[PDB]
Structure formats: C-alpha cells, structure tokens
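Reproducibility note. Readers wishing to regenerate the assembly model reported in the main text can use the exact inputs given here. Chain order matters: entities are listed in the order in which they were concatenated for prediction.
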Amino acid sequence: KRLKACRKHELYVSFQDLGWQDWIIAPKGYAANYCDGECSFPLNAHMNATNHAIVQTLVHLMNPEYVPKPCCAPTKLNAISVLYFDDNSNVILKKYRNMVVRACGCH
Amino acid sequence: KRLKACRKHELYVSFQDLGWQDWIIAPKGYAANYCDGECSFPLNAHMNATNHAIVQTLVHLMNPEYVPKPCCAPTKLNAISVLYFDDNSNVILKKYRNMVVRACGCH
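Running the prediction on these inputs yields the following structure tokens for the assembly.
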C-alpha cells in the first residue's frame, strides 16, 4: 500500500522542452505532475476509492483475464494561466483548467 | 482508431460471486461495466479528455520510459438500488452510489 501504491508523482514541464518557448511569454514552465502506481488491496482511505473501483479490484482478482485492474487517475487538479503571442502577434492571457494534478486515486 | 480507443465495455456482476447469496432479495446481479482502451492522440479536452492528459501524452512521447500514458477512467457513474433482508426479517431497500460505469475518458 504505501510504497508501490497509486499516488501523485512530481513532474515539472517546461515549454522549452515542448518546443513552445518562442511564443510563450509567461510562465516558462510549471509543476504538472502525474499519477502512477498499483491499484490493488489494500486501498488506502486517503484516495477515496468509489464503490465501483472496489468491485472492479475484487472481480479482477477472481477473473484476472477478463477484467483489468482499475487505473490510477487524478482526483483533484488546479487550473493555470498562460500569457502568449498568437500567430497575429496579439498578446493573450488564457486560463487553462485541469493542468496541475494535486491528488491521485484508483478509478 | 474507432473502437480500440478508451471506451466503456460491458460487464455483468452476480451478487453470488460477491457473497450476497442469502441476504439479497433482488436483483441477483447488475451491469457494473468498466473502462479500457489506449489513450493517445487524437484527444479532445472539451469532450472526454482533460488538458492535463494532452500535456502528459506529449511528455510521454518524448521520454516514454519516464512518464506513462494517461489512463482510461470513468467520467460518469450511476447508482443502483437493491432489496434485502436483515436479521429481524425486515425488508430494506438500499441505494448504492457510483456502482455503474456509464462513460469513460482519458485522465
């Protein structure tokens, strides 16, 4: 449960690595993060798994070949703002939601 | 591809396989379903995918050994009602939330 389990992993992404540095004014990057890890019993209470996930995790144990294990996905994300030049050189500030993952869980 | 992408799949679960053999009156099972399928371009943040999943997909394509692809998970879940018996022969109707997967997306 603790060690190998489903949880938020740190990931900072820079627009320079994506190849968008020439037109993005601010910021030059951000903490995006991502989810990863095993989704099997025991299911830590902090991730608040749903009734469906508990049933899937159990059914997966009985029929390993006909039902996959649930997947580690975001339970909470934060929006972010970006200031950039469009193709017509206009300066735009846009708010992008669901960009930063704060918490993960088995769904 | 049309049907190899992230989507909902049919899956029926019998209460007997869970152990509700003598306390359940009806139903005897239900269609829990499940999400499965690969997450990759093409993606739409305004429909089933999120902005975060798009960014994660791009980072994965550049360092596939460091960051995994986003995963296919539920975007919509429905409840189910059951009629059952207690120790005093009382007939009880109970609603269980988030038991049925209706739609899936890349998260």
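We highlight two features of this model. The helical segments of chain B are 51-62. The CA atoms of residues 48 and 105 of chain B lie 5 Å apart.
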